[PDB]
Design a protein around this ligand. Structure first.
Ligand SMILES: COc1cc2ncnc(Nc3ccc(F)c(Cl)c3)c2cc1OCCCN1CCOCC1
Ligand SMILES: COc1cc2ncnc(Nc3ccc(F)c(Cl)c3)c2cc1OCCCN1CCOCC1
Lengths: 299, 299
C-alpha cells in the first residue's frame, strides 16, 4: 500500500546525558539537549549481529508510529553499541504500577486505561500493524492519566493483502495468546484483541498472573476445553462479558478495538456502575526551566 | 442505577455429557457434573458473528436474573461453537403442555400458572427488565406445579431514567404485542402486561392461536377499531375482565403485574368459582443417587 515516510532521527552522543540506571541490557533515565535548541527532554536510553538486527527492526517500527497512546521514539545513536532514545515514562510499566498502588486505584482510572489502550491498539490496526505482545508489562505510564503501548519487539507491519502473519519459531508469551496463535502461529489484529482481554484482566485483578501456577503447555487444551480466566472480584458482569467476548475461539466473533473504545467509554462515563472497588470515591493519584516533554517536542 | 454483580460461570466441556437431542440450532438434554462435587445436574445445552453476539447478550440477561419463576442459566462454554447450559425443564414449554394435556388440566393449575408467571414478570419489572417476548411458547415447565419464564432473546435491561425502549427494526411477534409497540415500537413493562393478557388467553383456550388465520398487518387496525380476543369458553367474566384490562389502549390503565398476582391468587384460592371446566375435581398431573436439581445447586 502507501510509502512509509517516517523520519528516522540519528542523535549525536554528546547531545544526551545519562542520569541514573533504570534496568539491567541497561536502560538509563537521562536528558536529551538537542542542537542548540534551548530545550531539555527527559528520555529513556537503551544501550549479537542478531541483537543489533533486532533492535533496529524495533526502531524501524517505533519510528513508523505516531499516536498519543503508543510509545514515542526520539531517535537512535549509532555509537559502537547502538542506543535507542525514547520518551521517559516516569511511572514505569502499568503492571508494576497497579501492583504497587492497588489501594489507591479507582474505577475511573482502570476504565480510562482500558479506553486508552484500545485507542492505541485501534491506531496500530489502522497502520496494519499486529503487535503480538500486548500485556500490561508492555504498557508505560507517562502519568496516571496517560498510558502508552510499548514493546514492539515481536511486532509485524503487514505488507500487501497479507491478512495474517504466520510466525516462525521463537519464545512467545503463551498466557496472552489467542488460541489460533498458540496452535498454528497465526497472528491478526483479532489475536491482539485476545491479548487485550488478558491485559484488561491483569488490570482488573490489580496485577495478578494469568493462570498462575499452570504450565504453558497445558494452556492449549484448557482453552479448547472452553475454560477461561475467572471473573475478577471488582468486575460487574458488563465488564467481564467484554473480556470473555475477547476470548471467543471464533476470531471474527471477538470485538474490534474500535468497539472496545466505545464500550469502555460508555462505562468510563459512570465508573462505579461497572467496577465495584472498596473506597473508590476517596482515591487520588535542578536546572529545569527548559524542560519539555517529548509530546511537546515536534520536529 | 446499581452495579450488576451477577457472576457469569464458564464451564469446561468435559464437565458435561449430552444425552439426547431435544431440538434442531440443536439443544441437548444432558448432565452437568461439576468439579469433583459429587453432584449431577440435569441440564439443557444449546449449541454468525451476529449469532454469537446474540447468544452472549442473552447469557448476559439470564445471568443477571435470579427468581424461582425465571429460567436458570448455569453457565456458558466457550468451545469453538458457544454452548449455553440451563436448567433442564423436563415437561418442555407450556404451550405444548396445555396442547398435549388439555383433558387433564384443572382450574387450579391454570390459575397457579397465571400467578407464577405474574410473579416472574413482576420480578423482571423490579429489575427494570422489559421482556418483549412473553408468550406461552416462552414458558417452561419444570413440573406441572412449577413454571418459569424463558427466552430472553428480545429482552432489554433499561438503563438510567430510560422509561421505555424504542426498538430498531427486526422480526417481532405481532399477535402478542401492545398496540404502542406495533405502531411506534415502544416497549414498557406495561406492554409486557398486554402480552401477559394474550398468554393467559392462550392458556385459557388450551393452546389455541391468537387471531388464528388473520395476517399480522391487519392486527393494528382491528385493535384500534376496538376489537379483542374473544372470551374463552371456560372463563368466567371475572377472569376475562382481567384479560381485557390488559388490553386497554391506555398503557397506564392496564393492571400492574403486582396487581395481577393479587387478582389471580384470590381466584386460585377458589378455582371452580372462576374457571368452569368439565371434569375438574377428577384431574391429576440410571446412576442417579447424586442427581440434584439446579434449584438446589447454589454456588
Ligand atoms: C521510570 O521507570 C521507567 C521508565 C521508562 N521510561 C521509558 N522507557 C522505559 N523503558 C525502555 C524500554 C525499552 C527501550 F528501548 C527504552 Cl529506550 C526504554 C522506561 C523504563 C522504566 O523502568 C524500568 C523498570 C523498573 N523496574 C525494573 C527492575 O525492578 C522493577 C522495576
Ligand atoms: C424436555 O423438553 C425440553 C426441555 C428443556 N429444558 C430446558 N431448556 C430447554 N430449551 C432451551 C432453550 C434455549 C436454551 F439456550 C437452552 Cl440451553 C435450552 C428445553 C427444551 C425442551 O424441548 C424442546 C421442545 C421439544 N419440541 C420441539 C420439536 O417438537 C415439539 C416439541
Amino acid at each position: 500500500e502507501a510509502p512509509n515516510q517516517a523520519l528516522l532521527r540519528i542523535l549525536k552522543e554528546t547531545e544526551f546525558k545519562k542520569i541514573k540506571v533504570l534496568s539491567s541490557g541497561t536502560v538509563y533515565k537521562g536528558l536529551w539537549i538537542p542542537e542548540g535548541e534551548k530545550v531539555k527532554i527527559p528520555v529513556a536510553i537503551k544501550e549479537s549481529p542478531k541483537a543489533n538486527k533486532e533492535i533496529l527492526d524495533e526502531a524501524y517500527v517505533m519510528a513508523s508510529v505516531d499516536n498519543p497512546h503508543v510509545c514515542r521514539l526520539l531517535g537512535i545513536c549509532l555509537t559502537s553499541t547502538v542506543q535507542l532514545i525514547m520518551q521517559l515514562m516516569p511511572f514505569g510499566c502499568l503492571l508494576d504500577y497497579v501492583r504497587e498502588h492497588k489501594d489507591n486505584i479507582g474505577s475511573q482510572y482502570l476504565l480510562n486505561w482500558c479506553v486508552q489502550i484500545a485507542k492505541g491498539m485501534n491506531y496500530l490496526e489502522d497502520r496494519r500493524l499486529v503487535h503480538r505482545d500486548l500485556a500490561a508489562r508492555n504498557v508505560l505510564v507517562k502519568t496516571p492519566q496517560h498510558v502508552k503501548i510499548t514493546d514492539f519487539g515481536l511486532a509485524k507491519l503487514l505488507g500487501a493483502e497479507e491478512k495474517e502473519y504466520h510466525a516462525e519459531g521463537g519464545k512467545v508469551p503463551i498466557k496472552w495468546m489467542a488460541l489460533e496463535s498458540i496452535l498454528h502461529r497465526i497472528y491478526t489484529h483479532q489475536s491482539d484483541v485476545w491479548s487485550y482481554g488478558v491485559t484488561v484482566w491483569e488490570l482488573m485483578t490489580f496485577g495478578s498472573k494469568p493462570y498462575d501456577g499452570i504450565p504453558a503447555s497445558e494452556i492449549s487444551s484448557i482453552l479448547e476445553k472452553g475454560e477461561r480466566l475467572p471473573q475478577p472480584p471488582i468486575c460487574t458482569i458488563d465488564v467481564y462479558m467484554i473480556m470473555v467476548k475477547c476470548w471467543m475461539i471464533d476470531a471474527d466473533s471477538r470485538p474490534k478495538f474500535r468497539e472496545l473504545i466505545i464500550e469502555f467509554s460508555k462505562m468510563a462515563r459512570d465508573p462505579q456502575r461497572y467496577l465495584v472497588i472498596q473506597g473508590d470515591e476517596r482515591m487520588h493519584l535542578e536546572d529545569m526551566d527548559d524542560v519539555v516533554d517529548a509530546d511537546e517536542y515536534l520536529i
